[PDB]
Amino acid sequence: AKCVSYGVSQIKAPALHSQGYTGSNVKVAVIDSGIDSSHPDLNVAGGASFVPSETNPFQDNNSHGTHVAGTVLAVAPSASLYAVKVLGADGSGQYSWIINGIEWAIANNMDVINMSLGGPSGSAALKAAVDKAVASGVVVVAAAGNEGTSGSSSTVGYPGKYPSVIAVGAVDSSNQRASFSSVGPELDVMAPGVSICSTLPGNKYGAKSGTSMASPHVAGAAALILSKHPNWTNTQVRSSLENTTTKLGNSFYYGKGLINVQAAAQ
Numbered sequence: 001a002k003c004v005s006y007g008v009s010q011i012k013a014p015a016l017h018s019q020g021y022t023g024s025n026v027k028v029a030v031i032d033s034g035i036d037s038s039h040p041d042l043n044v045a046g047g048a049s050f051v052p053s054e055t056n057p058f059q060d061n062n063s064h065g066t067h068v069a070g071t072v073l074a075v076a077p078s079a080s081l082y083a084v085k086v087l088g089a090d091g092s093g094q095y096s097w098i099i100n101g102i103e104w105a106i107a108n109n110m111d112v113i114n115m116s117l118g119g120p121s122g123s124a125a126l127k128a129a130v131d132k133a134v135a136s137g138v139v140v141v142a143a144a145g146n147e148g149t150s151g152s153s154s155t156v157g158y159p160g161k162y163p164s165v166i167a168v169g170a171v172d173s174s175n176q177r178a179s180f181s182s183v184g185p186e187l188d189v190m191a192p193g194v195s196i197c198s199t200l201p202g203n204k205y206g207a208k209s210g211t212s213m214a215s216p217h218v219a220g221a222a223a224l225i226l227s228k229h230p231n232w233t234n235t236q237v238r239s240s241l242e243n244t245t246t247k248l249g250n251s252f253y254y255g256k257g258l259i260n261v262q263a264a265a266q
């Protein structure tokens with residue numbers, strides 16, 4: 001059959017879906033390792049690859065992007081997906097490629113960007129890309145990272161670390177922060193990211209854990225909110241999202257807490 005991550009119910013999407021809103025007409029760029037468009041439960045509307053060795057953004061050699069992309073879809077089934085391939089088959093990519101995929105989203109008028117990816121070093125140009133995307137009105141979401149903790153140090157990666165990005169940590173089914181989830185003052189909200197079941201390449205399904213799994217729930221969520229309020233700006237979308245979370249533990253670890261889409265959409 002299939003699975004829908006349990007995070008769809010947990011972030012309260014079904015209520016949006018039941019109000020009639022499902023991400024309709026919202027453009028979401030899934031900045032990852034491609035998306036296997038050949039999957040039946042997955043419809044990709046377009047995309048582009050910045051990985052020179054891997055020229056087909058609709059071919060996913062890793063599984064990462066298909067999974068992440070199926071999670072967005074699960075939260076917002078009618079969203080339009082763009083596969084922006086910046087991570088090759090090993091799971092890694094240049095910062096350059098990433099900016100390139102980010103510059104492609106701005107230019108193609110994406111409404112939402114999901115980056116379930118991260119690096120330990122800052123880039124002023126990656127920082128400029130995300131800032132420009134947000135300035136262009138795109139809602140940018142990224143994984144907060146899977147670096148655990150380190151004393152008092154922020155373990156939030158880049159770009160999750162920039163203030164213009166919404167960095168998403170991961171919770172499990174019982175809202176407990178996942179051991180691996182990065183922490184730090186830049187962590188903004190949480191979403192499920194432990195053993196999340198989603199689509200895989202070759203008419204498959206599988207679960208994975210990671211802030212990368214959390215990120216797409218928050219991105220599919222912004223797409224639900226948009227479909228209900230297409231005139232809201234990104235700033236508005238994002239604010240509703242942070243302002244209506246279910247508070248959990250302290251902020252260094254959980255951020256503002258878990259997102260509640262029913263509430264966010266108002």
Ligand code: NA
Pocket residue numbers: 160161162163164165166167186187188
């Ligand atoms: Na941030």
